[PDB]
Design a protein around this ligand. Sequence first.
Ligand SMILES: *[C@@H]1O[C@H](CO)[C@@H](O[C@@H]2O[C@H](CO)[C@@H](O[C@@H]3O[C@H](CO)[C@@H](O)[C@H](O)[C@@H]3O)[C@H](O)[C@H]2NC(C)=O)[C@H](O)[C@H]1NC(C)=O
Ligand SMILES: *[C@@H]1O[C@H](CO)[C@@H](O[C@@H]2O[C@H](CO)[C@@H](O[C@@H]3O[C@H](CO)[C@@H](O)[C@H](O)[C@@H]3O)[C@H](O)[C@H]2NC(C)=O)[C@H](O)[C@H]1NC(C)=O
Ligand SMILES: *C1O[C@H](CO)[C@@H](O[C@@H]2O[C@H](CO)[C@@H](O)[C@H](O)[C@H]2NC(C)=O)[C@H](O)[C@H]1NC(C)=O
Ligand SMILES: *[C@@H]1O[C@H](CO)[C@@H](O[C@@H]2O[C@H](CO)[C@@H](O)[C@H](O)[C@H]2NC(C)=O)[C@H](O)[C@H]1NC(C)=O
Ligand SMILES: *[C@@H]1O[C@H](CO)[C@@H](O[C@@H]2O[C@H](CO)[C@@H](O)[C@H](O)[C@H]2NC(C)=O)[C@H](O)[C@H]1NC(C)=O
Ligand SMILES: *[C@@H]1O[C@H](CO)[C@@H](O[C@@H]2O[C@H](CO)[C@@H](O)[C@H](O)[C@H]2NC(C)=O)[C@H](O)[C@H]1NC(C)=O
Lengths: 175, 175, 175, 322, 322, 322
Amino acid sequence: GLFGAIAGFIEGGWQGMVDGWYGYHHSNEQGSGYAADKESTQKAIDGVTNKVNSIIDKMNTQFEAVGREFNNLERRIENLNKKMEDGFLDVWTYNAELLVLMENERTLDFHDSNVKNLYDKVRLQLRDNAKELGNGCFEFYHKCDNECMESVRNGTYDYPQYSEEARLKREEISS
Amino acid sequence: GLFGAIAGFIEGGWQGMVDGWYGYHHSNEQGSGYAADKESTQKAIDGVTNKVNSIIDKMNTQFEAVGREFNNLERRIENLNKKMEDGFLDVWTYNAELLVLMENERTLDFHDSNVKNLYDKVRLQLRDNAKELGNGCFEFYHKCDNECMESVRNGTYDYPQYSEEARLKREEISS
Amino acid sequence: GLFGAIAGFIEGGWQGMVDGWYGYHHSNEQGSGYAADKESTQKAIDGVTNKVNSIIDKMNTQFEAVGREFNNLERRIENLNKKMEDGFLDVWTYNAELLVLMENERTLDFHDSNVKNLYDKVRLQLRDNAKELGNGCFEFYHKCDNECMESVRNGTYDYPQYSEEARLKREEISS
Amino acid sequence: GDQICIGYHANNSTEQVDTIMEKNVTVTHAQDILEKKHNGKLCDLDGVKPLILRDCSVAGWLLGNPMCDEFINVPEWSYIVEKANPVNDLCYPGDFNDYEELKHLLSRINHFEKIQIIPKSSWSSHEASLGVSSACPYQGKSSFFRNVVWLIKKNSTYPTIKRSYNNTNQEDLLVLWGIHHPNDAAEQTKLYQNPTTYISVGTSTLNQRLVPRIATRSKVNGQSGRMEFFWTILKPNDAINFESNGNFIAPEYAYKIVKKGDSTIMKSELEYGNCNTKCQTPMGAINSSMPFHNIHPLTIGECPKYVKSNRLVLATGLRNSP
Amino acid sequence: GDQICIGYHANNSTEQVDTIMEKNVTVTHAQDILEKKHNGKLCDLDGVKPLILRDCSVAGWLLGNPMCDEFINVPEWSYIVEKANPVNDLCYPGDFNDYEELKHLLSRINHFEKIQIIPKSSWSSHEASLGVSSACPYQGKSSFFRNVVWLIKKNSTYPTIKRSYNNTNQEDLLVLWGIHHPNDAAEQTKLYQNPTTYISVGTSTLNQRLVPRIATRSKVNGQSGRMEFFWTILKPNDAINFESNGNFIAPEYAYKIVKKGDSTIMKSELEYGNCNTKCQTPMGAINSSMPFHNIHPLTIGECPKYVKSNRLVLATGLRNSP
Amino acid sequence: GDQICIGYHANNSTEQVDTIMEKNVTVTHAQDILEKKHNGKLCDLDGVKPLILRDCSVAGWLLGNPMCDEFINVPEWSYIVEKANPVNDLCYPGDFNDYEELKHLLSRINHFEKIQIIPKSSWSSHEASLGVSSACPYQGKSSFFRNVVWLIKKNSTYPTIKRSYNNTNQEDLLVLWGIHHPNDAAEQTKLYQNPTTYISVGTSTLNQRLVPRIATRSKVNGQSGRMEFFWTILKPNDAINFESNGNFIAPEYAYKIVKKGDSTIMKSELEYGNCNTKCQTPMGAINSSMPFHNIHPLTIGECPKYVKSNRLVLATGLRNSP
Ligand SMILES: *[C@@H]1O[C@H](CO)[C@@H](O[C@@H]2O[C@H](CO)[C@@H](O[C@@H]3O[C@H](CO)[C@@H](O)[C@H](O)[C@@H]3O)[C@H](O)[C@H]2NC(C)=O)[C@H](O)[C@H]1NC(C)=O
Ligand SMILES: *[C@@H]1O[C@H](CO)[C@@H](O[C@@H]2O[C@H](CO)[C@@H](O[C@@H]3O[C@H](CO)[C@@H](O)[C@H](O)[C@@H]3O)[C@H](O)[C@H]2NC(C)=O)[C@H](O)[C@H]1NC(C)=O
Ligand SMILES: *C1O[C@H](CO)[C@@H](O[C@@H]2O[C@H](CO)[C@@H](O)[C@H](O)[C@H]2NC(C)=O)[C@H](O)[C@H]1NC(C)=O
Ligand SMILES: *[C@@H]1O[C@H](CO)[C@@H](O[C@@H]2O[C@H](CO)[C@@H](O)[C@H](O)[C@H]2NC(C)=O)[C@H](O)[C@H]1NC(C)=O
Ligand SMILES: *[C@@H]1O[C@H](CO)[C@@H](O[C@@H]2O[C@H](CO)[C@@H](O)[C@H](O)[C@H]2NC(C)=O)[C@H](O)[C@H]1NC(C)=O
Ligand SMILES: *[C@@H]1O[C@H](CO)[C@@H](O[C@@H]2O[C@H](CO)[C@@H](O)[C@H](O)[C@H]2NC(C)=O)[C@H](O)[C@H]1NC(C)=O
């Protein structure tokens, strides 16, 4: 994975999560658990489905055609037709195969991208009120609960609230 | 947008900016304003134009061809020609449509990429002499003016100058 | 380069390095030198080779075909054939050209991506035990040697070891 | 302190996918783009049945080959199905002129109806009921094509036939006739008195004169004589005139025909299955949605592009690796 | 504190664009790749005019159909334009041999010039000025093809014609002739004395012997006779020899021809508009730059690939959403 | 303090590459995708030699043109190579029926062997060794095709020939025969007594009757007579029967033939170079691996797709800019 996501900092994806495609895993003082992210997962499903569809729907030109029809004093023409059929087979076969190859690649990168997006959204929402572990994980400078992590998913985490609780807790670890 | 840019931290793009495609928006103690970045915007225009052109210019093989010519005792051959024409229409129609779809996607990601580039250039130029807001915005630990932000665009921002003005101003906010 | 790598923070690539495609350049108290990274460089070679091959191997449909055969009372048919040959020439010529153009782009971005991956792997492995210069370079808050940088490549750098050596060394520079 | 970690989905999927740069990549969800399922029967094209000649060539069918039947009283069809090597063709050996072109013309028909053009009993001064051979055995009794009459001399005379038919129908009509090329001069005289002989047929279009070609040939179904057949479309208001001195195989029946589109003749050993598709295949119908199939090249209909591969598998989910 | 914020452009654009993963995406600037504009007229191809037969078939034009004219004294052309159903074809009913091939050969001509090969008045011992019918009415007076002569018996005699022409020009020359197939034996004698008849034509290439085919046919423009026509290219130093006993429709005019390239016959009801393109369409010319168009499949020239869609709209700017 | 810096490779490469968005980009390593190299000789296809007719057309070869030889005693071939304008075709001017079709049939042959079907000396009551002309000069002495016999009257008589050959071999065999179309009636009587004449050939398939066509023609190689040739495949158990009254150019030799696949006739002025490929070109063989070439459109074999360009250069390394 190109974006440091799958082959990178997040080694392995949680099987414990059925909710969606992307998500969180908390370990607060109540317990621990994983609830998937929705706007992200939803926008992805949309995207992938769409890709599949357009790949199908954009051919929606094909129309009536047929099989084969010359006698054996018309062999030159039979050959003419062969060539043409053969030539189309070579075109379609080659395109289809490479289309899939190329688009498969873009797909797996598209996922990596979103993961890193989600990682960076969390990261920015809470600058130095949290520690960057490197496992794709964040440790809070302060204490936190279940209702606490709702705003974290929401995008309504308030920095100036737990800042001085972190700030003093930061110097305590220093030296 | 894949790179955390358009659909990410920078929610909405400034209409107030006519200068270019990408740029800055200051709010210093003189006033505020937006002057676009040039090497970036320029390299993009070049790139997009180039993409459009090569899409046109690489077909520069086509050449003389024609319409339709068999009597009604040569119907099998008329059919042969139909199929061939038909088959080419199916090829070109499919390719063109998907080409556009794929390249449109890569274009919109190309923009996102550049935005993040620009964001990250600014970010690195001034490590902890500035605060990372998360709106795609930076707040200075020190005071700044108009001539001050020229070097910021230039790429000639001097870190060791305003470092100890920031460093002390940083501890003042701490606890 | 899209990922802030080649056209970005790392201006120019070291010619001094023959080892691989990607790597490090230390300047510790013993001396200085560059040993390339291997899993990265190896995964890239694999990937590029693979791309080249599949571009060759996926055509592995072609088969027996021929040249040209009608007398000058069958000119309409000769024309039929011309068109067909001509039309395939236009398809293959266009596809091949754009295929190359597109994949060349994705290749050069693929490299940029990996560079940034490598940059970010190092970066995260050692949070605030090092300074982020912006040249694509890191300066250590502590002193370091040759055996020291093995774990850095390894991915076995220990943060809580040199943390308080950095932490006190950090406040010394502050104000 | 307290944590939040960003992660991605992973399930018990083992479906692999390929990438421009990577092979055998395990994936969460995947979608096959390539159709591989057919239903192994022949079906209507857009609710219009095919014409399935079982053991008969089109020639065999059109001419009344005694072992074929005229039971093909199906008024309309979308395509024809012949076997690889139909057993019933020209029981009497011979040739059929522009046969392929006629086949093609007949491949798809809007309306088709058999009309008695020149009735078998109107040959008062020639022998109508004698032109019969062991090459076309009907039920042990020897016989001959039903839709066409092989006229023989009455007494020892073959008056010059002058005879025509006006197409007073609105439909185009397809008409057929033949020459007999005897083996030798004696055989000539025996069947028709006259040694020198012609058939001439005229339309507003057609302007032909046939002359029998006498020659020692090899026996085929025991016959060294030969039958050559010919056809045209007689336009609504037009008229066909025949004139013969005698080696004439006279039409008896012809076909009204309304043509509103083309298709082709399919070769298949399959049988009809009551059933419909938009796309048919000698190995069976395809209920298509995918833009590609690998079933068979010789299709009829609106089909997915035929391709040479087993896998066109597109990644839906993500890198689901254990 | 003080701020700088990075943002992107946005304008009052409402032009949508599609993406592999997204539909109806609002964009800053966009570029249409698909040509949709034509100019509704017929134009020169690379500064060479077309040959626009108005109400005539090519046959009509080449033979002198009285209602067509020989005013097509245009020496050169790049393609030919027939109507869907030209009104003036073979006034006298008949057939033209290898017509399509001839049409194709004539579709584009470098030089074309009409030459009096065998002058209408050099038939001293045959009737030249009588072969005339109400099927080809000229100005109320009945008449016949201008570029060809219908020879009739003089007194009650038709001497065997022996006659040839050496092509002493440098250009290839196209030559035409025909047979009359009368309706019946009486009609034969009436026009030509001799009951049995032939035309034979020889070249260094051609070696033909025609024989009129007598038969009752249906009247067409009141005529149950038929005219059958034939042609060749007579090579620079060669010679064509005609010999007939009589059903001969003699050439009078033939065409010098220089052929340096092919094209096709276009079917259109449009008229010339003084004008030039590199690409033409039965609905009008295209001043192409786009690599795709959706105007019409049957083009002539250097054209954008014809495609089945309305929108091939490529994204220039970015996500301009309100 | 102490540093580490991340960088990328750079070498002394100046090979440029193009990108969807960028031109003339300097790169570390690159790979050409487009084949441009051929070896300028003609080679076996998959270890099977071509048949290289040097100065002979196929016709020239098959009939025995005196200047060609029968030295083409190669049993098997994969494709044929004629020159643009072979010098030795039909020494005696004439025509060859379905010539192209026969050329196509012969383009690739599994086995081919020349067999004496009707010996030149078994014509007891006709003249076999006189049918000779200055149009086919052999060594100053005038002469005629080797593989075929031009029978002339003996005394002042040409008895009707009746003659047949059973193909008792297992192989199909290709058989050839001709008519002579004399210049005039006198010439007729001189060579063959009888004024009215025919050749008729019959198979289980073939049913023909030729009739010489007399006409003044232009001399060609000094001859205004013409030779018209014809052919068939005579099936293993079948038999061909000839009967003529006389303008008959009788087979002497015919060809055992085993056909297991098709190819084409290539036009090249090159000569054999002992050598093998899987893909051949009138300018030379290609040892292909690339998926594209730009050498020549008229290939034979398993070839890279032919493309119109000079550069298909793919980026291996990275942005190596000084
Ligand atoms: C095939 O038979 C039909 C019978 O319907 C022929 O059509 C008819 O042709 C006759 C001429 O032969 C037409 O009669 C004419 O009518 C006008 C007045 O309307 C009269 O003044 C003339 O004396 C003249 O004879 C008649 O219109 C026409 N009927 C139809 C239904 O079209 C047809 O001609 C026959 N085919 C041929 C060419 O033999
Ligand atoms: C149509 O007439 C032309 C011109 O009259 C014929 O070609 C002419 O034939 C003459 C005399 O036969 C040729 O001259 C010859 O030239 C060769 C050398 O090239 C020489 O060895 C001979 O002895 C002879 O003189 C020449 O091609 C041409 N005459 C001239 C002066 O141009 C042609 O034969 C006629 N068409 C046919 C097929 O009858
Ligand atoms: C050509 O001769 C062959 C070879 O003898 C004939 O084939 C035999 O003919 C008899 C007579 O009907 C049959 O029993 C078989 O077809 C063949 N027997 C064997 C042992 O081959 C063949 O009939 C001849 N062809 C013609 C047209 O007469
Ligand atoms: C990637 O995985 C596929 C899984 O199908 C491999 O497919 C096998 O192909 C071999 C040929 O060497 C066959 O013998 C097996 O039947 C297939 N495996 C099974 C049982 O699934 C494929 O070979 C792999 N690609 C490579 C070469 O790595
Ligand atoms: C996506 O946007 C296009 C807008 O061009 C939609 O096309 C609509 O089609 C109607 C006709 O029924 C046009 O009058 C309008 O331009 C469009 N409708 C409206 C109300 O915008 C298209 O239907 C839209 N959505 C999709 C993807 O189906
Ligand atoms: C970039 O690509 C090619 C290859 O170098 C250039 O082709 C050159 O044309 C210009 C003059 O028109 C000269 O600089 C060189 O002599 C040419 N090079 C060749 C083909 O040998 C191309 O023009 C370059 N960029 C541009 C637009 O100048």
